[PDB]
Amino acid sequence: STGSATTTPIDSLDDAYITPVQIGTPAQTLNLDFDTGSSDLWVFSSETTASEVDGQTIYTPSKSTTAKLLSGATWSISYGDGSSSSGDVYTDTVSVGGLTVTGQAVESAKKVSSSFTEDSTIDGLLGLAFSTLNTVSPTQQKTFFDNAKASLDSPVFTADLGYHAPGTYNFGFIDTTAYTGSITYTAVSTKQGFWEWTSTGYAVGSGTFKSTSIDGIADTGTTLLYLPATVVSAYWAQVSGAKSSSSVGGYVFPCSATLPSFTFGVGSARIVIPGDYIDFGPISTGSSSCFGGIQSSAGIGINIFGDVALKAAFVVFNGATTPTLGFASK
């Protein structure tokens, strides 16, 4: 089997991407944030504290003839940005782009933190990291991909995120028309439950490539590119007037600037992030200070190849017995 679904930016900045997901019978379609950095499929629901729902579409398990309460199971998750959610668990039929999994754990939120409430466009998350990170207790549950894997034509999914435009998540096949040149594959460590890999270096603009190992995670659920302070300082030094602002929470730059590109290495291959992908617009409405899309990972504890990086590539998440990651230009 295979599946193919379009993923759409939630706003003009590509702050996140939503993908429609069918849950239950008859189908209830929710727009979920596909997140290769976590492993829970959770949704706003009829059980979510009413004051914490503000415009989201909810899953109502009582209206699904295939929903079954997973007795005694609860979940609770906290994300790198300080947001969180928790609740109980159903199993139900879940389909993405024509690919169907029966008996998928659908984690129903009883509580969500303010950042989720305040984002009306995201109805929940669909985790695509390794199932070892799944938070369901006392019986850990499998991700949608893990459940689908054996049925797929090939045990892979691909992320093809757009810049200020829709893109695609495919399951079970590689669309050879969706990228240019070749796909370069690179090793993955699953030790921390992430799609963790080592970039071979970077360049800023038309500058020379610096060969240096940068361990980090391919994370579709993180907006920005978080890299070591040395790398990030080297990038922003090429933008007149750019500076790190503790009050704002990262590097800012004059909105009048033209940003240089940023290149990262994948083995001997190179992925070029155009400068415009690094512009996250005014820090507040009407400001001439703009927020940068490359930020320091210092104090995150891990480097994160988030959407800023991934959207410059066609990315293969290869879930073979020994997983690997593939990157192509597009």
Curated annotation (Swiss-Prot):
The active site is at D35, S199. The keyword Protease applies. Coiled coil: none annotated. Keywords: Aspartyl protease, Disulfide bond, Hydrolase, Protease, Signal, Zymogen. Its EC number is 3.4.23.22. One of its GO terms (molecular function) is aspartic-type endopeptidase activity. It is an enzyme of class 3 (hydrolase). It catalyses: Hydrolysis of proteins with specificity similar to that of pepsin A, prefers hydrophobic residues at P1 and P1', but does not cleave 14-Ala-|-Leu-15 in the B chain of insulin or Z-Glu-Tyr. Clots milk. One of its GO terms (biological process) is proteolysis. Disulfide bonds join C255-C290. Residues 17-328 form the Peptidase A1 domain. The keyword Signal applies. Belongs to the peptidase A1 family. This is Endothiapepsin. The chain holds residues 90 to 419 of 419 of the full protein.
